[PDB]
Amino acid sequence: VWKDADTTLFCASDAKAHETEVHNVWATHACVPTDPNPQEIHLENVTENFNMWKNNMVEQMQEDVISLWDQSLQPCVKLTKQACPKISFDPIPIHYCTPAGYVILKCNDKNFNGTGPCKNVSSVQCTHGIKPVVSTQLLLNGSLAEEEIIIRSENLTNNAKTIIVHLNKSVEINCTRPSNDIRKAYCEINGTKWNKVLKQVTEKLKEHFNNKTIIFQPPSGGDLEITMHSFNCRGEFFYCNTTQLFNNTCIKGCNGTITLPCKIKQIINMWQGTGQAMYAPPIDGKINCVSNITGILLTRDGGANNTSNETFRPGGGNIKDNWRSELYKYKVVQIE
C-alpha cells in the first residue's frame, strides 16, 4: 500500500497576517494556515525502516530556511551599498505536511536513533511545529527525547560523522547584550543544572563506547562560526566561547553559575552558501534571548589508538543536521 518517495511538501504555520517579523512574513506566502484538528492514526501492526540521514524532508526544510534568510536578512554592501534596515526576527514553528497521494509515517519508539525498523508507527498528515533555529554546537528550543537520552550518528565508527545527542532534560541559556562596548555581550547558564546533564551524557555516551572514560575538549580549529556557538538574536549574530561548558573539572569540587563571553559580529560567513555578508550594527537598547538547549552536536577524534578513552568536541555548521535533529522520526511515503 506504499513505497518510499519524495515530493514537494507544503508548510503550515500559525503565522499572523500583519506582524513584520521575518518568519511570519515569509510563511504568510509559502505556507498555509495550520490545521485546527490534525489527526494521528496508529497503524495496525506495521514495522518500518526509517533513516534520518537520507530524508528528503531535510533538504526541503533547508531550501526554505535559506530563502527565508537571504531575502528577509538584507546586508549592507552589495554581493557577488544595499541599505541594511533593522527587522524583527524570532523564529516561529513551521509544520511540514504531505500533499495528495502521500502521507507521513512517524516512529513513536521513544528511544530511537532515526535508523532501522520501528514497529510503533503512526500516520500524521503534518509533522509537528519545528522552529527553524539556525545555530552551531548547541541545538536550541526544539524537540526533546521522551525517555532516555539518544545518540544519533550515521556511523559512529567513522569519526568523520557529526554526532547529534538528544537531551532528555532541557537547560536554559540566558544570553544578553545589555543596553550599554556594545559589540560585547554574554550568556549565563545555571551551572549545577548543566553539569548533571553533561555527566548524564558521557555515561550515555560511555554506554556506546565500552565503559571507557569520556573526555571533552575545545574545538581543534576552523571558522569562528564552528569554533564557537554561533547564533542569531533579534537579527543579531552571537559568537560564544563554550570553553566553560565542557569544563571537565567542574563536575569534584566546584561552584554554581556559569558565564560565557560572546561577541556580536557584523561581518559573518554565510551558512547558506560560500561567502561573507555585512549587517548594520546593534542599537543602544537591551538585547536578550533565552533558549532551551534541547541538544548538542559533537565530533570525535577517532585518533586513539587507543590509550583508554574517547575525546569529544563541539561541531556543527552543516545546518541540515539541525533539521534532522527534529525530522529524524518522520518519513514521506507514497500510496497511489
Epitope: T8, C11, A17, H29, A30, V32, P33, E63, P99, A100
Partner: antibody
C-alpha cells in the same frame, strides 16, 4: 484526476445578487496545500482575479470587490462557491474556476475550469 | 492590486524568437518569485505555461521560458510556430494579499 465545473444561472438582473458554484473531483483540503479561486473575463478583454478561499474559512478577496463579495466551502466543504451582490453590465463576464496551489511557494492558478458565461441585464 | 503592464501586441516569424514583457512594482514582481504566465487561444480557457518566474508544467515546450529582473518579468518563446498565435497573460502575487493579472499581449505570427 482533478477537473472543475462551474454550475449556476447564466442571467442576473441589475441590482441583484449573482451566485455560482464549482465542483472539484480532487478533494478540497487535503490535497493540499491548495487554494480555490474564482476568476473572470468580461468578453474581448482581460483577466481579473476575483478571490481565493482555503478549506478552513480563510478568504482572500479583490480590494475592488470587497463590498459585494463572498466565497464559501460547502457540502462537506466539497465544492466552493461565489456570491457577488449588486451588479451591473460590468459584472458580465465568463467566470472561470481555478485551483492555485501553494506547496512551498508557487502561487499560480492551474486546473482551470472551462468557465460559464453570466450575462447581465433585466 | 496594480494592473501589471504588458505591451498590447507583438509579432514574429516561423523559427524566430520573441519575448513579451511584464512590468509591475516592488510588491508584486518586486517582490516575490511568483510570476505566472498563461496562453489563451480563442475561445478556450487559459493555460498555465510558466509558474514561479521561470518553471514549466510537464507538457509545455522548451520554447517557453520565463525571466525576471527587478520589477519586470518576461516570457520568451523560441522556434516560433502558428499554434502560438494567441493572447498571453501575466500574473503575480502581491504583498498583502492578492493576485493581479496583466493587460495581455496578442502574439501575431507573421508570414
Amino acid at each position: 484526476e482533478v477537473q472543475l465545473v462551474e454550475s449556476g444561472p447564466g442571467l442576473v438582473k441589475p441590482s441583484q445578487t449573482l451566485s455560482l458554484t464549482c465542483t472539484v473531483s480532487g478533494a478540497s483540503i487535503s490535497s493540499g496545500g491548495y487554494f480555490w479561486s474564482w476568476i473572470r473575463q468580461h468578453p474581448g478583454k482581460g483577466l481579473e482575479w476575483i478571490g481565493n478561499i482555503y478549506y478552513i474559512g480563510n478568504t482572500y478577496y479583490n480590494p475592488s470587490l470587497k463590498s459585494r463579495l463572498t466565497i464559501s466551502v460547502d457540502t462537506t466543504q466539497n465544492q466552493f462557491s461565489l456570491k457577488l451582490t449588486s451588479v451591473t453590465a460590468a459584472d458580465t463576464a465568463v467566470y472561470y474556476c481555478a485551483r492555485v496551489p501553494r506547496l512551498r511557494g508557487g502561487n499560480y492558478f492551474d486546473s482551470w475550469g472551462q468557465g460559464t458565461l453570466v450575462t447581465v441585464s433585466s | 492590486q496594480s494592473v501589471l503592464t504588458q505591451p498590447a501586441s507583438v509579432s514574429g516569424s516561423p523559427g524566430q524568437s520573441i519575448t513579451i514583457s511584464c512590468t509591475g512594482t516592488s510588491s508584486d514582481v518586486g517582490g516575490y518569485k511568483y510570476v505566472s504566465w498563461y496562453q489563451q487561444h480563442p475561445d478556450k480557457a487559459p493555460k498555465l505555461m510558466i509558474y514561479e518566474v521561470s518553471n514549466r508544467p510537464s507538457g509545455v515546450s522548451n520554447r517557453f521560458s520565463g525571466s525576471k529582473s527587478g520589477n519586470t518579468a518576461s516570457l520568451t518563446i523560441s522556434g516560433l510556430q502558428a499554434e502560438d498565435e494567441a493572447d498571453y497573460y501575466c500574473s503575480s502575487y502581491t504583498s498583502s494579499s492578492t493576485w493581479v493579472f496583466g493587460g495581455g499581449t496578442k502574439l501575431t505570427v507573421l508570414g
